[PDB]
């Protein structure tokens, strides 16, 4: 039983704080705004069992963008390859990441 | 950085303190104390009034939990609907408060 | 069906209440000078 | 996912299974599980604060107050354990066995 | 008479004026002969630290005005 | 209504004060003319960037600069 | 090692929990998850929540733990195997858990969890004059309304229920 | 020496703080507890000499035993005393507490506390006056002031 | 540097807790006709550190604790507890300017009856439990109206931030918009750090502790009792700051606290003890039905009159 009493009565109860694409206090965007707009915007009214594989595509782009998965695999690789090539002592770090480049602005 | 560099100076200055006051009367050489209260030996009756007056005060501290927020709900664009919940929220404590009254629950610690 | 294991056990009260199954006493002493026994309920 | 995460969620599950395995106290009991809340709390927070995702922000806040409450109403209840037993041991509760 | 409390509620006064004249003498100095910069807010911050960087003696109170443009 | 009143302020005076200062506090905001000032002025306080509009053609009352004629004034928070 | 420093208090914060889940009396239990609130506390201010870490001192701590130590006092009259056993257990699991993820920086009890320090995963943009956690509490009053009427209306109730149940009548 | 020099000066010192910042837990026995009630009135006033009012007999540093002691309670008189803190020190007040007074040939006085504690002021009088007992909280200070324990502690 | 400037905020503590205690004695010396202290030092300047010398060299009273942990750490907590509700103090600048001061302060107020509580179940003594609840439940009940009375006010500052609040009292004090909410904080204040006329404790927990460790929760106690008078000053009577001058916000600020204090110790020279259901009264139903309706009128007030505060 789902008595949609809110949608019904038009009030609105509880829907504003359901998603991060919602109306936030003072246009606050959540950092995965534009991943979940497009995630709802897919899968929106084309019901649950279509929506699960016709936006896949989406749904992988925000679920990466919430927990950033791939990101910090990727910068695993990055790093470890980085001291690994450190320790072989067949690279060295540029000046600018060791802190004496005076940054940008 | 500063603060737990700041915590961690008070914490220390204040076990050292205790270290000092629990044992540098210690070398004192004084004497062994041979055998070193209202109650002799009963059990601990349980007040049923304490306990009542904690959860009182456990109750009235969530509805200040809820009451926290004013200083910046009060920058709302929406105040009509703030000023309405918030005076809900310290009605509804008050509404607590008197059916604590009412009911006979502070009584003997009024 | 009453085994071993369950053949300890009675039937409950009928009105389902069971039985419930002292007062503090202090010595106020001379620790001008007086002592006292408190019988207190509280 | 992150690596704090793994703590919260393992200190979830060390309150639990102490909420879950009794010793003798009711009230070693209401402490594991006011533990697992402050772990949802903990869990919570940091998943809010760190997905910016700003309305919610509140919601822990409420967690802990209902929670709280909750708690409140069982400590009331292993009062009127100890206005039975003397203790609140779990093995006092066993008049429901038959 | 009365007056003879005043020697410890000056001692107690001194005490007490110690820790704020204190902090403020310190927040001057470790601060370039000025107040210590208020970031409460991560635009505040967001400033400090572009002061930070544009100093280029990795400072944020060092401050550059007209002559560090041309 | 008054012999009742003046009854409850000579035994509980705490509470007569207590309900008054709450019923004031709640009617008097809807009595109030300043109450429309405090949502004008939370309104007014920028927090955001105002993010500029794409001149289409037809925007007549929208500014192309903060200094001209058109667009929202606070001339009412300065002289009140 | 400060970079890691969230993940350490994490550490302390398991550890507080195998202080009390293990049981060793509710007094001491009451101890452990203090020191457990105080160390979660420290790890909700090192994402910024700072108005949510002082909520679990001013009413987890300083509000609840105060009421659980206070109904732990007036029982337990004053004066283990299992308990140092349990505990000696979940921390020696809690630091196989932290050689397996600082060795491999990965691991999968259930989910898997990177093993670099969780510095990483944060943004790098300001909110302006306002804590966007302390806008979204503020919202509690404008946007949550619904969520005022039933958290007002379950603590009245929690205070009718607590006379109720411990009249006796 | 050196070292006989250093234990003067420490001698010195924890005598001032000890003669300095009595504490006294008074027995009011009987009458004496109102001239001890005069010794803190305004005129005499122990608290400038730091001589607390009513310290509790657990960081107490004297007990001023004043008024008579009766054989219902020297047990209790006794029980503080080896509840106190060591240095303690024992003031007697007045004629029943120093030798038994007007009721030393009862059948229900102890004749003197020095029976039940040792006694180092015996104040004499029937009270004595406020001014007198006040002299002889002088005079137990005066015996502080010559105490050489750690000078013995460094010639043992 | 920064150690530096903690040092001259925790040891001038110290002091000032040391000689308060010569400042109670003298003070209430010549508020009963008498004169306090003034043999043992000049003008009784030397009776605290006599008395600091005379309580470290007492022997320990050694008890038979319950728990030998909650027993080390009660002095522990009440003493970094003491110190640190200083560092967001602002005169007129704080240790640690932090945005949240406020709430920090409460927060680790909130925290101080544990060190009651552990003194009192650490003690074998049941009279002493029976006293150390009696004492906790009187602090978490008057904790209840500092909480909405400092609501209340922070409602006319706009944040939790202290150095704010010197900002909102420029133009006037703040006890001249918020007197009854000042009065019902004073007294709460008042019968937060067990301070007469609602010292239950020394009317017929922590006496099995030794002399130096008593010592110790004294100075705690005097610590609370000074610093809660400084955040009453600047809560209430907030001083004029010129920002290139801050000394004479330090000297205005100390010579109101100061006051402040001398009115503790004045209070306490005035008045009986209240019975333990009498300050209960006294809370539940006098200072919380009024701190609840100026709670509601400190809401709807700066809504009516235009009148709030920025947020930032
Ligand atoms: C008892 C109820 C007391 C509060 C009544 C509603 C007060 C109010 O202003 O609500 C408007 C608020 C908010 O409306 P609003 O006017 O703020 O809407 C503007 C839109 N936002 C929120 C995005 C700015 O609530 C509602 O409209 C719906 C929720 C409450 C509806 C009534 C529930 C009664 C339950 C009885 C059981
Ligand atoms: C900073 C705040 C204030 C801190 C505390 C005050 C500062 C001074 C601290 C040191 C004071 C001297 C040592 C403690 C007092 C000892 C008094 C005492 O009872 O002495 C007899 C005791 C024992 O003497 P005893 O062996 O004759 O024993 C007397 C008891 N009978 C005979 C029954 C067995 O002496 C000591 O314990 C000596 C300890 C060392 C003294 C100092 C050495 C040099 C230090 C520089
Ligand atoms: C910050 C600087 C200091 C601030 C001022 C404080 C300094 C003075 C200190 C004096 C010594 C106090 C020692 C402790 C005393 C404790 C006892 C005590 O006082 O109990 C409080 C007493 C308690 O009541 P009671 O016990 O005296 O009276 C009997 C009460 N019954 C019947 C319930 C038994 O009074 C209060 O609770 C009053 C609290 C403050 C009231 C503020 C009211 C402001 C006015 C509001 C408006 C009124 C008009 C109506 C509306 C008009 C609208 C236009
Ligand atoms: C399988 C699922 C659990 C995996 C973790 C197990 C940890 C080790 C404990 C094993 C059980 C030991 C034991 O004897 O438990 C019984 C005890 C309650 O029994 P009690 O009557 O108090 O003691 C007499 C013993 N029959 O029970 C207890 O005291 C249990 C306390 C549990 C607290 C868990 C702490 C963290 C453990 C690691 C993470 C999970
Ligand atoms: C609508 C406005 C908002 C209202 C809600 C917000 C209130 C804010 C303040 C919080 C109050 C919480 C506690 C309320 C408890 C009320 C019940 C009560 O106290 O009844 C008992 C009392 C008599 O006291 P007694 O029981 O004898 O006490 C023993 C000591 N002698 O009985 C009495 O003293 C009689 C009390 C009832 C009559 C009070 C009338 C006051 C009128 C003031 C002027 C008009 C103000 C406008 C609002 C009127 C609302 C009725
Ligand atoms: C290597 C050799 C040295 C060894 C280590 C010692 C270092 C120095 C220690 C302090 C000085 C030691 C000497 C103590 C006093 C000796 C002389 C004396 O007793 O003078 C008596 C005089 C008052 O005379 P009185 O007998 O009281 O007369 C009653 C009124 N007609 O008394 C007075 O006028 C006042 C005496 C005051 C004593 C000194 C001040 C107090 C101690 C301060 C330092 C220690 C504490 C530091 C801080 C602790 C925490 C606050
Ligand atoms: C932020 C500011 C905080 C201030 C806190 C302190 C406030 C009060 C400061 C002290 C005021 C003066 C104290 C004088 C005490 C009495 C000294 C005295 O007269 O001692 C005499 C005694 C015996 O000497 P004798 O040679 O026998 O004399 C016979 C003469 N034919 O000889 C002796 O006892 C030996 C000498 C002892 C000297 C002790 C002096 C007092 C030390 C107190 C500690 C604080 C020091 C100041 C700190 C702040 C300033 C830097
Ligand atoms: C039984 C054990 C022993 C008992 C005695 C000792 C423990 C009890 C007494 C000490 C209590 C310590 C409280 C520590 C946290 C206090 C809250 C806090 O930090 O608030 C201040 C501030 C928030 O203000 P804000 O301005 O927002 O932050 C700056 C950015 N603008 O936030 C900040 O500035 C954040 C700074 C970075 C994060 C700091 C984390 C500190 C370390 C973790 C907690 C330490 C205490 C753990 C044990 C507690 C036991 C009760
Ligand atoms: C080393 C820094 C100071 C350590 C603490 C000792 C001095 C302060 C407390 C002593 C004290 C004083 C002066 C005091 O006057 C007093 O009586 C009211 C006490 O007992 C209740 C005290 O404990
Ligand atoms: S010595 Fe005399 S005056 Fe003194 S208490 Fe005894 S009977 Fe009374």
Same mark, same amino acid.
């Given at each position: 039983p789902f008595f949609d009493v809110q949608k019904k009565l038009g009030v609105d109860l509880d829907h504003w704080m359901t998603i991060q694409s919602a109306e936030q206090p003072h246009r606050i965007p959540a950092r995965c705004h534009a991943f979940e707009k497009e995630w709802i915007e897919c899968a929106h009214g084309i019901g649950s069992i279509r929506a699960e594989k016709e936006c896949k595509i989406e749904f992988e782009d925000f679920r990466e963008c919430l927990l950033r998965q791939k990101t910090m695999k990727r910068l695993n690789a990055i790093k470890r390859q980085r001291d690994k090539l450190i320790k072989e002592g067949k690279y060295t770090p540029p000046p600018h990441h060791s802190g004496q480049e005076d940054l940008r602005p | 950085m500063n603060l737990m560099i700041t915590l961690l100076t008070n914490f220390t200055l204040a076990t050292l303190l205790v270290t000092i006051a629990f044992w540098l009367p210690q070398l004192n050489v004084y004497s062994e104390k041979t055998s070193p209260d209202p109650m002799g030996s009963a059990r601990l009756p349980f007040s049923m009034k304490f306990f009542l007056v904690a959860i009182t005060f456990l109750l009235f501290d969530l509805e200040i939990a809820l009451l926290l927020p004013l200083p910046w709900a009060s920058q709302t664009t929406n105040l009509n609907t703030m000023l309405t919940m918030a005076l809900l929220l310290i009605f509804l404590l008050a509404v607590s408060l008197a059916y604590e009254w009412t009911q006979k629950g502070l009584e003997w610690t009024e | 069906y009453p085994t071993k294991e369950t053949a300890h056990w009675k039937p409950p009260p009928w009105n389902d209440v069971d039985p419930p199954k002292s007062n503090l006493t202090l010595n106020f002493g001379p620790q001008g000078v007086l002592r006292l026994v408190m019988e207190l309920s509280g | 996912?992150?690596?704090?995460?793994?703590?919260?969620?393992?200190?979830?599950?060390?309150?639990?299974?102490?909420?879950?395995?009794?010793?003798?106290?009711?009230?070693?009991?209401?402490?594991?599980?006011?533990?697992?809340?402050?772990?949802?709390?903990?869990?919570?927070?940091?998943?809010?604060?760190?997905?910016?995702?700003?309305?919610?922000?509140?919601?822990?806040?409420?967690?802990?107050?209902?929670?709280?409450?909750?708690?409140?109403?069982?400590l009331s209840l292993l009062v009127m354990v100890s206005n039975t037993y003397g203790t609140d041991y779990v093995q006092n509760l066993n008049l429901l066995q038959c | 008479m009365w007056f003879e409390v005043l020697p410890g509620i000056a001692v107690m006064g001194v005490c007490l004026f110690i820790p704020g004249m204190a902090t403020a003498r310190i927040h001057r100095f470790s601060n370039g002969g000025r107040e210590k910069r208020?970031?409460?807010?991560?635009?505040?911050?967001?400033?400090?630290?572009?002061?930070?960087?544009?100093?280029?003696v990795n400072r944020y109170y060092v401050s550059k005005g007209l002559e560090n443009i041309d | 209504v008054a012999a009742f009143l003046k009854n409850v302020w000579a035994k509980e005076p705490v509470l007569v004060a207590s309900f008054a200062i709450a019923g004031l506090a709640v009617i008097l905001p809807t009595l109030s003319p300043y109450t429309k000032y405090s949502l004008m002025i939370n309104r007014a306080t920028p927090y955001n960037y105002p993010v500029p509009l794409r001149d289409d053609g037809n925007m007549p009352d929208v500014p192309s600069h903060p200094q001209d004629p058109q667009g929202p004034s606070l001339e009412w928070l300065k002289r009140l | 090692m400060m970079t890691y420093i969230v993940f350490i208090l994490s550490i302390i914060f398991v550890m507080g929990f195998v202080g009390f889940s293990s049981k060793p009396s509710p007094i001491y239990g009451g101890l452990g998850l203090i020191v457990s609130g105080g160390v979660g506390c420290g790890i909700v201010l090192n994402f910024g929540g700072s108005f949510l870490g002082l909520m679990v001192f001013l009413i987890y701590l300083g509000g609840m733990m105060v009421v659980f130590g206070y109904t732990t006092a007036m029982a337990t009259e004053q004066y283990n195997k299992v308990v140092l056993g349990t505990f000696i257990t979940g921390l020696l699991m809690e630091f196989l858990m932290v050689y397996y993820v600082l060795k491999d920086k990965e691991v999968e009890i259930v989910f898997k969890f990177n093993g670099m320090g969780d510095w990483v995963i944060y943004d790098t943009g300001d909110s302006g004059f306002f804590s966007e956690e302390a806008m979204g509490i503020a919202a509690l009053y404008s946007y949550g309304t619904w969520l005022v009427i039933v958290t007002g209306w379950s603590l009245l109730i929690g205070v009718v229920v607590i006379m109720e149940i411990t009249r006796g009548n | 020496?050196?070292?006989?020099?250093?234990?003067?000066?420490?001698?010195?010192?924890?005598?001032?703080?000890?003669?300095?910042?009595?504490?006294?837990?008074?027995?009011?026995?009987?009458?004496?507890?109102?001239?001890?009630?005069?010794?803190?009135?305004?005129?005499?006033?122990?608290?400038?000499?730091?001589?607390?009012?009513?310290?509790?007999?657990?960081?107490?540093?004297?007990?001023?035993?004043?008024?008579?002691?009766?054989?219902?309670?020297?047990?209790?008189?006794?029980?503080?005393?080896?509840?106190?803190?060591?240095?303690?020190?024992?003031?007697?007040?007045?004629?029943?507490?120093?030798?038994?007074?007007?009721?030393?040939?009862?059948?229900?006085?102890?004749?003197?506390?020095?029976?039940?504690?040792?006694?180092?002021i015996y104040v004499?009088?029937?009270?004595?006056?406020?001014?007198?007992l006040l002299y002889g909280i002088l005079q137990l200070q005066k015996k502080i002031k010559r105490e050489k324990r750690l000078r013995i502690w460094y010639r043992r | 540097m920064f150690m530096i400037n903690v040092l001259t905020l925790i040891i001038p503590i110290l002091l000032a807790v040391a000689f308060l205690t010569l400042?109670?004695?003298?003070?209430?010396?010549?508020?009963?006709?008498?004169?306090?202290?003034?043999?043992?030092?000049?003008?009784?300047?030397?009776?605290?550190?006599?008395?600091?010398?005379?309580?470290?060299?007492?022997?320990?009273?050694?008890?038979?604790?319950?728990?030998?942990?909650?027993?080390?750490? *009660?002095?522990?907590? *009440?003493?970094?507890?003491?110190?640190?509700?200083?560092?967001?103090?602002?005169?007129?600048?704080?240790?640690?300017?932090?945005?949240?001061?406020?709430?920090?302060?409460?927060?680790?107020?909130?925290?101080?009856?544990?060190?009651?509580?552990?003194?009192?179940?650490?003690?074998?003594?049941?009279?002493?439990?029976?006293?150390?609840?009696?004492?906790?439940?009187?602090?978490?009940?008057?904790?209840?109206?500092?909480?909405?009375?400092?609501?209340?006010?922070?409602?006319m500052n706009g944040?939790?931030?202290?150095?704010?609040?010197?900002?909102?009292?420029?133009?006037?004090?703040?006890?001249?918009?918020?007197?009854?909410?000042?009065?019902?904080?004073?007294?709460?204040?008042?019968?937060?750090?067990?301070?007469?006329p609602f010292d239950l404790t020394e009317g017929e927990f922590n006496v099995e502790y030794a002399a130096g460790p008593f010592a110790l929760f004294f100075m705690a106690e005097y610590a609370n009792i000074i610093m809660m008078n400084i955040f009453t000053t600047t809560l209430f009577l907030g001083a004029f700051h010129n920002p290139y001058m801050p000394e004479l916000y330090t000297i205005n600020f100390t010579i109101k606290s100061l006051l402040l204090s001398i009115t503790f110790l004045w209070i306490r020279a005035s008045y009986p003890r209240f019975r333990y259901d009498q300050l209960m009264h006294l809370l539940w139903k006098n200072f919380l039905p009024l701190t609840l309706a100026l709670c509601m009128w400190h809401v709807s007030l700066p809504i009516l009159l235009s009148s709030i505060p920025p947020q930032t």
């Open positions: - | - | - | 996912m992150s690596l704090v995460y793994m703590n919260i969620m393992m200190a979830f599950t060390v309150s639990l299974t102490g909420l879950l395995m009794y010793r003798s106290h009711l009230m070693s009991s209401l402490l594991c599980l006011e533990g697992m809340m402050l772990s949802l709390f903990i869990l919570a927070t940091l998943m809010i604060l760190n997905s910016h995702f700003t309305l919610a922000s509140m919601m822990p806040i409420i967690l802990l107050v209902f929670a709280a409450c909750e708690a409140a109403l069982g | 208020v970031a409460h807010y991560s635009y505040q911050w967001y400033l400090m630290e572009r002061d930070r960087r544009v100093s280029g | - | - | 020496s050196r070292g006989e020099y250093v234990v003067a000066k420490l001698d010195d010192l924890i005598n001032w703080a000890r003669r300095s910042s009595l504490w006294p837990m008074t027995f009011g026995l009987a009458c004496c507890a109102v001239e001890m009630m005069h010794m803190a009135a305004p005129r005499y006033d122990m608290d400038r000499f730091g001589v607390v009012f009513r310290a509790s007999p657990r960081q107490s540093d004297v007990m001023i035993v004043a008024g008579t002691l009766t054989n219902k309670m020297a047990p209790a008189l006794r029980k503080v005393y080896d509840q106190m803190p060591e240095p303690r020190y024992v003031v007697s007040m007045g004629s029943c507490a120093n030798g038994g007074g007007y009721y030393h040939y009862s059948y229900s006085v102890v004749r003197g506390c020095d029976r039940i504690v040792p006694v180092d004499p009088g029937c009270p004595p006056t406020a001014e007198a | 400042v109670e004695r003298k003070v209430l010396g010549y508020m009963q006709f008498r004169k306090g202290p003034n043999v043992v030092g000049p003008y009784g300047l030397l009776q605290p550190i006599a008395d600091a010398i005379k309580l470290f060299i007492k022997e320990p009273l050694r008890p038979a604790t319950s728990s030998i942990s909650m027993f080390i750490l *009660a002095p522990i907590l *009440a003493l970094t507890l003491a110190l640190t509700m200083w560092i967001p103090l602002p005169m007129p600048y704080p240790l640690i300017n932090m945005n949240l001061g406020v709430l920090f302060m409460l927060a680790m107020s909130s925290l101080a009856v544990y060190s009651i509580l552990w003194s009192g179940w650490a003690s074998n003594s049941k009279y002493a439990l029976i006293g150390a609840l009696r004492a906790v439940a009187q602090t978490i009940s008057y904790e209840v109206t500092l909480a909405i009375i400092l609501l209340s006010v922070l409602l944040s939790f931030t202290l150095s704010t609040l010197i900002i909102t009292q420029e133009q006037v004090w703040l006890i001249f918009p918020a007197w009854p909410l000042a009065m019902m904080w004073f007294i709460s204040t008042l019968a937060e750090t067990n301070r007469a």
